[PDB]
Design a protein around this ligand. Sequence first.
Ligand SMILES: O=C1C(O)=C([C@H]2CC[C@H](c3ccc(Cl)cc3)CC2)C(=O)c2ccccc21
Ligand SMILES: O=C1C(O)=C([C@H]2CC[C@H](c3ccc(Cl)cc3)CC2)C(=O)c2ccccc21
Ligand SMILES: [Co+2]
Ligand SMILES: [Co+2]
Lengths: 383, 383
Amino acid sequence: KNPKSDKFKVKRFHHIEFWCGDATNVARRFSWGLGMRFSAKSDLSTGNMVHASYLLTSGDLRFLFTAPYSPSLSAGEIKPTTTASIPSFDHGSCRSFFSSHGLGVRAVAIEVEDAESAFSISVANGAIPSSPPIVLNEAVTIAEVKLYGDVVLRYVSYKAEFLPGFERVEDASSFPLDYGIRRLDHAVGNVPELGPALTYVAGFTGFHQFAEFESGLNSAVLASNDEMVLLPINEPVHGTKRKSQIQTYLEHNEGAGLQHLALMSEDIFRTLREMRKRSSIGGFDFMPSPPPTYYQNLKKRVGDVLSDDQIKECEELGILVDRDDQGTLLQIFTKPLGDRPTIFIEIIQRVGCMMYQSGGCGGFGKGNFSELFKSIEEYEKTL
Amino acid sequence: KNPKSDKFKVKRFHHIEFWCGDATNVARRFSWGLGMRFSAKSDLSTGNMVHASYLLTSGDLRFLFTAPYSPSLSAGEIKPTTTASIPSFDHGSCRSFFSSHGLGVRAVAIEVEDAESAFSISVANGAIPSSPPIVLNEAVTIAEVKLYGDVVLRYVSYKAEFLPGFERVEDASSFPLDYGIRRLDHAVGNVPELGPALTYVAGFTGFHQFAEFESGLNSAVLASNDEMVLLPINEPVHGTKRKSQIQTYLEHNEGAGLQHLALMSEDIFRTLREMRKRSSIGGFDFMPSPPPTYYQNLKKRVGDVLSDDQIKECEELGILVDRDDQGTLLQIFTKPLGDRPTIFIEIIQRVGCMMYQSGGCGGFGKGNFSELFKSIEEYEKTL
Ligand SMILES: O=C1C(O)=C([C@H]2CC[C@H](c3ccc(Cl)cc3)CC2)C(=O)c2ccccc21
Ligand SMILES: O=C1C(O)=C([C@H]2CC[C@H](c3ccc(Cl)cc3)CC2)C(=O)c2ccccc21
Ligand SMILES: [Co+2]
Ligand SMILES: [Co+2]
């Protein structure tokens, strides 16, 4: 059931912004590790005396990395005379965010029909304002409201390449890396209490619950009208045996924040081959693979969707597989992206739900909990 | 003239410590860009609740990358009960350093015969104490004094692998990258006033002036007894036509600090080939190459040291060449390592002065200023 109750016209995920201490080094690591190319910049060389911002792209996926310069470079400026290309940026907020959370997502940006209207309607419906709408070069409008913790939901709207004040990156500096990643599928937050977080966000967006099919947490998913903007939220489940990874996150992050980004690949086998080749030479590490008993049980679950050769290829790369009632999902998780056990990345590919592919095809993998536990039991029995 | 006036026994450069906001991402970028392997760690997985520290090595070169965790993880601890593996570390100092300077060198560490004696003699002779000697697991002693700006000179001494509390990195996580870099040759500071900086440091070390052979700056070099620990210092020259790059550094760094690290390669052609292949895929960029007229003048200067084939190989890679009265120097400079136009790296190889090779063989390249200017004039004439 999709009531299509969006309070303003939402299009697609637009970009994710990381707040960094040094944007150069994080962006270069991510570029190599994920196969994203350098496509735009806003920094001292472009006249920005406030922040250094570097944009990576792969297909439709846009990762922005921003760090502050010394406030002394822009001490004469006021907001009317700022050289910042992102007017919501504030040195104090950025330094406070990073000292509090370390490397993490500051903004989940969605493209909307009219960012000023989205902002007004959102705040009229309970959203906590973070940055009021501002029009950039009479071309783009940007506004921000709080989402959870210190993460903001950023509205972007275009009258008619990233943002004014950003420069195209000279092709000699822009190597065409591509491991197959094509778009952001979903962005997941961790909170202390799921209920109030859901009520708040669904309250001001009109996003509806997406609805699914005991260890770790409780979650739920909010979705836009066409279910292309997907925002899951997790809360911990306390008092288990094995400590909730959601609670570990909240401790090490100093509170709520973005837990993981799920990136859709047009060929998850190629993506995982390319990323795993680079894990020990600057790229990203992946979580430990499930036991072969897990893959020794995949034939009985998705043997009609993947050949035995494709299932053995899943086993080589450590891919997990889950299944909805309309689709099938292939997924895998990285280890945390930075020093703290907080944010990580998921690589995903979905098969089914063709009409274009509808959003959320196959679910989010929650059936992999029971499957993994069964795998462990069976493997211990075979030991 | 080498008066050999060291006030305590100094051995060799031991390590350089960068203070970071996220040590993981900087260390992975540097590892790939420079061809250094991951060899030790001290972090949450080793019981360190205070800081994340990752050690990269290439030959004898040791780069340490450190970032703070949330203070809340170690809120119960006191200095007697600390889980930090580097007892001089302080969350407040590290966050203040990084917000003030961005990514940069916090410590230039030298191995000494007795770090407690070095510290006492240094402070007795004018050094400003930064961290008093502390003995780690009855095995290693570490102490720190201020060097310039917020950079410290760190003394390390061993009774008899990096530091207690650091763990060997599991070989699966430790890929054996190597582009030929083998040791730190020199470490250079930028200061507002050269005279007082020299007086202070030579005052407490007993290091002597190393002594050489109009645009940018004035410099001088302090050296240990065998001239294997080399510490150049630069000051700006004001009132030129083209603004001093030393003054630009001081502005963007918010004051004095470490300007560049010069890394000796056992094969500078292989190193530069390997680093340049990776410049646009996560590694380091190099400064623009001198005009071919420069290389069209190398035969008349070092034609007796390098064949014409080796000189054309210098031209491909953009290497500069200078010459002492005892040796010849091959060198090249990276673009700044991070967001700010502050710290960069120099790759160097020295030929001559065999007895082992004596330190500073060939000088530091200061003759390349005049040579480059002449190159520009000649190239403009040929245009
Ligand atoms: O986005 C996700 C998501 O990524 C998982 C994940 C959690 C980890 C699970 C898992 C990972 C690895 C193994 Cl070996 C077993 C299970 C797989 C599904 C969920 O369970 C989930 C539930 C509800 C809404 C969204 C989501
Ligand atoms: O360590 C150095 C050093 O690295 C340079 C450098 C400065 C930049 C010069 C240069 C670089 C590039 C070109 Cl195209 C021309 C000159 C080469 C020497 C010095 O001039 C110097 C002088 C005195 C003590 C130490 C040092
Ligand atoms: Co997910
Ligand atoms: Co030098």
